[PDB]
RNA sequence: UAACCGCAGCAGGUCUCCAAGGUGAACAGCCUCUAGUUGAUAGAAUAAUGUAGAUAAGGGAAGUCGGCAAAAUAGAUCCGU
RNA sequence: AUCUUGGUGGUAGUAGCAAAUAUUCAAAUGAGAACUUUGAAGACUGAAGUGGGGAAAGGUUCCACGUCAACAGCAGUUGGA
RNA sequence: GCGGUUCUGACGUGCAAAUCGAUCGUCGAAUUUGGGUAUAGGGGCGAAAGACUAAUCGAACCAUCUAGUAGCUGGUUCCUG
RNA sequence: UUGGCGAGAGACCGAUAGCGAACAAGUACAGUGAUGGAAAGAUGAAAAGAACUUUGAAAAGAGAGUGAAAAAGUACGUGAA
């Protein structure tokens, strides 16, 4: 598959970056089927697409 | 030649010595592959990513200078390949790499 | 026009071209002149240089400011087990240069030698000298005879000797093989010596002595392609220089229209046979003397090995040489020694040498102790020891 | 159809052949000559270890300024390499005419490389651009392959005074 | 640093808005978050000669047309000019 | 005729394809994967950005589906083709 | 930001028909710059170098007069007698 | 009467010739612009342009076939160097 695509919308529909979006990797097949944003919000919904949380900068040690 | 597990050390700092820094984790790899075929000799090797994520852990040129491996000579189920066996080479997750000697596993 | 100013050229034309040796045994090219009163003898020897140190002694030289005096000497120790004897070579003068006539070998040859034969031994079958073997057998009338040959027309005699590699530290098993002369006697008692000696050891003590000078025949360690600025130690040019430093920048005139083989050009540097000579013996050491690197004055029984091996080498468990100062070749490279050939007579060559004290600290950093006891006594208990 | 000049018996001879190969002209005629002459399993062995850097290709021509291998001396030579590109399009021509010779019933223990021969295609032209708004060729040296596998398969005038000579000698023999 | 111009998918050129945390005088340099990218023929080896980057005993411009190149100096506070 | 147009050599499988820190493991796809996609890791731009928009200019390059003969100075299943 | 001193550094069949690196000049005005607009070839414009006027300047580019003239250079095609 | 329209001709040229142009030629393409401005004709009587088989992922090969000839296969008359 080549879901370059997917990846694109799924950072769209989630209104994060591409460097945040996750496709299962085991779940190829479904997400090629996804061309749609409803298509793509339907695989946010049930875990398929996930937000990746914000790498961490920590105020710590300059507190 | 047979099934067989066995766990090893690799000294990667006698191999990595004088390697320019870009290249030290990616020569670690490559002779990860070398002492598997050394050892079970089968021309493929199969790197589990868990080791991948364990030679890079410090960066390109922040190799371990031992790692304790686990090799697997297994059989090759796909099609019809060129070697009937390879070696599947995985971590073993310990506190410290020095002190072991090659042991078999069951 | 002329040159500017005079400058010596630079390198010697006498050590042209500077290749790489043909074998990594240098050859022996000339032996001492014989002289046949006395008894039979090797000219030289085969050893395999182990390392250097260094050494204190007291001068005697009359004149000297340092006449009575300690000095400290820089030494190298060659590791010289005996030579196995395993044949004798009969040459003949010609019109056109010495020719050997035959060859006769000893019956029996140990796999250290029959090595040297083979480039792939372990898939031989391992025939060398199977048949030859089989001439010994009945009276072995057909070595009888040969030697008869030898004794007849040669006018200089040769042994083959070998090598027992498996003795020293090193990885190989394949001995070296040379011929060395037997000078002393007729050429009858020679090639009877030879006889006599088949299959038998010879050790450095029967060659050589304490004070001797001698000669030292190796291949120069190597250094691969170099430039000229260290191959022949040419200037380097000035830092503005286009297109490179480390050059000759004329190198030639318009006419001849030709490179000339006088100037200095990039090429193989070292692995060059040489010839050193007058190294004085400094000590004859026995392989089974456990104080073969004690003295008169320093009575701490020990060997000649420093604490950790000789770096690159190993230990010294045979009978060695030790050499004043240095000689060709690098650690584990197969030696020859070689009698002087001439009767030197200087003050420096007729000096009887006497050592107060043999260095034997570890070579493999800035070693401060000469034994492990005195390293125990000094540090006193560690935690590893507990 | 219409090969180079052959001396084989058709009969006992299949063929095969590519045209306009995007492949290196003067690396396949030294693949070429490599084979050439050989039995037809022998060089298809070969041809495996060329690929696995076993044995060489040894370039006897088109080798000006290449380095030189140990591999070469089994065929006398200090220049040698292993063109995996070359190799490859010389592999499914010899894959294909083994089969047609297996189509016309010939016996493939038997079948040697009898002719095999590379010829120059058309170049095919792009440009590279050079210092100083220069523009020069860069060009690619295509080739046309063929070959051709086959089985193996195992008055006196006399003047009167020579004849005189003759009759005399025989008169004497008897 | 591939949508424009430069013969091209060219290290060149081509007007402007928005602008996070630390260090620090600072939109300096260095490190990070959001966002973006991970492109640029590769593999093996580590000779000479290079290019770019370095260090050097003792001497200290003797080098050279010429201290060219490099080094040394360097912030801030007080003093003293 | 440093003739005109066209074609072709030797040079030569040679010079070379080395600026912009950097890649790695697995799976998928596929005849074929250093280079495609996903995942994992390692890094970089470091907000006077390799981020987000525009003006001039270009003109469909946007997006999808199919898809590799040519083009992307290696490759190619990928692409501003 | 604008410039372009030195290395007479890289490169010098280039990344490039003027670039690259370091070093350097200037950095709140006689400053830098977009767009609009004016000036056209014996003409313009010039804090002046004969500079600049679309890679063209001690007189641009395009077409024509024009196959311009040449006491000068080069070439000038079959055989034998 | 080197234009326009309609005719008839030639000891003229025969695809590098003859108009620049025998052809989708004042075209494609270059140039900011005025302007500049190519290359490129011929399978066979007829597409009868190779069904079908086989090897190959495929391009293609090998057969088979069409044709008077594929020593005519669209990379098409002849086919020099
Ligand atoms: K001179
Ligand atoms: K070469
Ligand atoms: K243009
Ligand atoms: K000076
Ligand atoms: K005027
Ligand atoms: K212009
Ligand atoms: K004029
Ligand atoms: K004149
Ligand atoms: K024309
Ligand atoms: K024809
Ligand atoms: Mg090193
Ligand atoms: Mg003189
Ligand atoms: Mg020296
Ligand atoms: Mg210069
Ligand atoms: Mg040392
Ligand atoms: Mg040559
Ligand atoms: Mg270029
Ligand atoms: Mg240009
Ligand atoms: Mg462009
Ligand atoms: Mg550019
Ligand atoms: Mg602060
Ligand atoms: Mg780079
Ligand atoms: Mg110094
Ligand atoms: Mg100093
Ligand atoms: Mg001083
Ligand atoms: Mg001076
Ligand atoms: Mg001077
Ligand atoms: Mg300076
Ligand atoms: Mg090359
Ligand atoms: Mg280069
Ligand atoms: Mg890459
Ligand atoms: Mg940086
Ligand atoms: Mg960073
Ligand atoms: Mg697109
Ligand atoms: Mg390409
Ligand atoms: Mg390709
Ligand atoms: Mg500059
Ligand atoms: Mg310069
Ligand atoms: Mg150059
Ligand atoms: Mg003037
Ligand atoms: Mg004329
Ligand atoms: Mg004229
Ligand atoms: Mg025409
Ligand atoms: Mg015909
Ligand atoms: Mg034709
Ligand atoms: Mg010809």
């Not at chain 3, 500077?18 to 030289?44: E, M, W, Y």
């Not at chain 3, 042994?159 to 394949?174: D, N, S």
């Not at chain 3, 000759?248 to 490179?259: E, K, T």
Request: aromatic share 8%; hydrophobic share 35%; net charge positive.
């Amino acid at each position: 598959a080549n879901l370059r695509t997917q990846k694109r919308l799924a950072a769209s529909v989630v209104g994060v970056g591409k460097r945040k979006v996750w496709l299962d990797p085991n779940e190829t097949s479904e997400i090629a089927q996804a061309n749609s944003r409803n298509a793509i919000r339907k695989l946010v919904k049930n875990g398929t697409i996930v937000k990746k949380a914000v790498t961490v900068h920590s105020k710590s040690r300059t507190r | 030649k047979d099934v067989v597990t066995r766990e090893y050390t690799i000294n990667l700092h006698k191999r990595l010595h004088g390697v320019s820094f870009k290249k030290r984790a990616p020569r670690a790899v490559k002779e990860i592959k070398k002492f598997a075929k050394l050892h079970m000799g089968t021309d493929d090797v199969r790197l589990a990513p868990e080791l991948n994520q364990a030679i890079w852990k410090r960066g390109v040129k922040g190799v371990e200078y031992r790692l304790r491996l686990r090799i697997s000579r297994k059989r090759n189920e796909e099609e019809d390949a060129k070697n009937p066996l390879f070696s599947y080479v995985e971590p073993v997750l310990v506190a410290s790499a020095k002190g072991l000697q090659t042991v078999v596993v069951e | 026009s002329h040159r500017k100013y005079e400058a010596p050229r630079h390198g010697h034309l006498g050590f042209l071209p500077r290749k790489r040796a043909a074998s990594i045994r240098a050859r022996v090219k000339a032996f001492p002149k014989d002289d046949r009163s006395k008894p039979v003898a090797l000219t030289s020897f085969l050893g395999y240089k182990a390392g250097m140190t260094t050494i204190v002694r007291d001068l005697d030289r009359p004149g000297s400011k340092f006449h009575k005096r300690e000095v400290v000497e820089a030494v190298t120790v060659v590791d010289t087990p005996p030579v196995v004897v395993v044949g004798v070579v009969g040459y003949v003068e010609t019109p056109r240069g010495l020719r050997s006539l035959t060859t006769v070998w000893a019956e029996h040859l140990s796999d250290e030698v029959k090595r040297r034969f083979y480039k792939n031994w372990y898939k031989s079958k391992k025939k060398a000298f199977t048949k030859y073997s089989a001439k010994y057998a009945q009276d072995g009338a057909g070595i009888e005879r040969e030697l008869a040959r030898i004794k007849k027309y040669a006018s200089v005699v040769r042994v083959l000797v070998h090598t027992q590699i498996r003795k020293t530290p090193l990885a190989q098993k394949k001995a070296h093989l040379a011929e060395i002369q037997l000078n002393g006697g007729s050429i009858s008692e020679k090639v009877d010596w030879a006889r006599e000696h088949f299959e038998k050891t010879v050790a450095v003590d029967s060659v050589f002595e304490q004070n001797e000078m001698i000669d030292a025949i190796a291949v120069t360690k190597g250094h691969g392609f170099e430039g000229v600025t260290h191959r022949w130690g040419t200037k380097k040019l000035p830092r503005k220089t286009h297109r490179g430093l480390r050059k000759v920048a004329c190198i030639g005139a318009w006419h001849p229209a030709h490179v000339m083989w006088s100037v200095a050009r990039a090429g193989q540097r070292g692995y060059h046979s040489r010839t050193s000579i007058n190294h004085k013996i400094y000590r004859v050491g026995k392989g089974d003397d456990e104080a073969n690197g004690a003295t008169s004055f320093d009575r701490t029984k020990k060997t000649i090995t420093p604490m950790g091996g000789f770096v690159h080498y190993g230990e010294i468990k045979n009978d060695f040489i030790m050499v004043k100062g240095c000689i060709p070749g690098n650690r584990k490279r197969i030696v020859t020694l070689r009698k002087s050939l001439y009767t030197n007579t200087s003050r420096k060559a007729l000096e009887e040498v006497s050592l107060k004290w043999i260095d034997t600290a570890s070579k493999f950093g800035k070693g401060r102790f000469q034994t492990p006891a005195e390293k125990h006594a000094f540090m006193g208990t560690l935690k590893k020891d507990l | 159809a219409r090969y180079g000049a052959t001396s084989t018996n058709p009969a006992k001879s299949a063929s095969a052949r590519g045209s306009y190969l995007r492949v290196s002209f003067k690396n396949t005629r030294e693949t070429a000559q490599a084979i050439n002459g050989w039995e037809l399993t022998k060089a298809q062995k070969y041809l495996e270890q060329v690929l696995d850097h076993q044995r060489a290709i040894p370039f006897r021509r088109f080798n000006s300024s290449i380095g030189r291998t140990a591999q070469g001396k089994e065929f006398g030579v200090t220049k040698a390499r292993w063109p995996a590109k070359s190799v490859k399009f010389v592999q499914g021509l010899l894959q294909n005419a083994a089969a047609n010779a297996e189509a016309k019933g010939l016996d493939a223990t038997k079948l040697y490389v009898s002719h095999i021969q590379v010829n120059q295609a058309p170049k095919q032209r792009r440009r590279t651009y050079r210092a100083h708004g220069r523009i020069n060729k860069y060009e690619s040296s295509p080739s046309h392959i063929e070959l051709v596998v086959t089985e193996k398969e195992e008055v006196v005038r006399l003047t009167s005074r020579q004849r005189g000579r003759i009759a005399a000698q025989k008169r004497i023999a008897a």
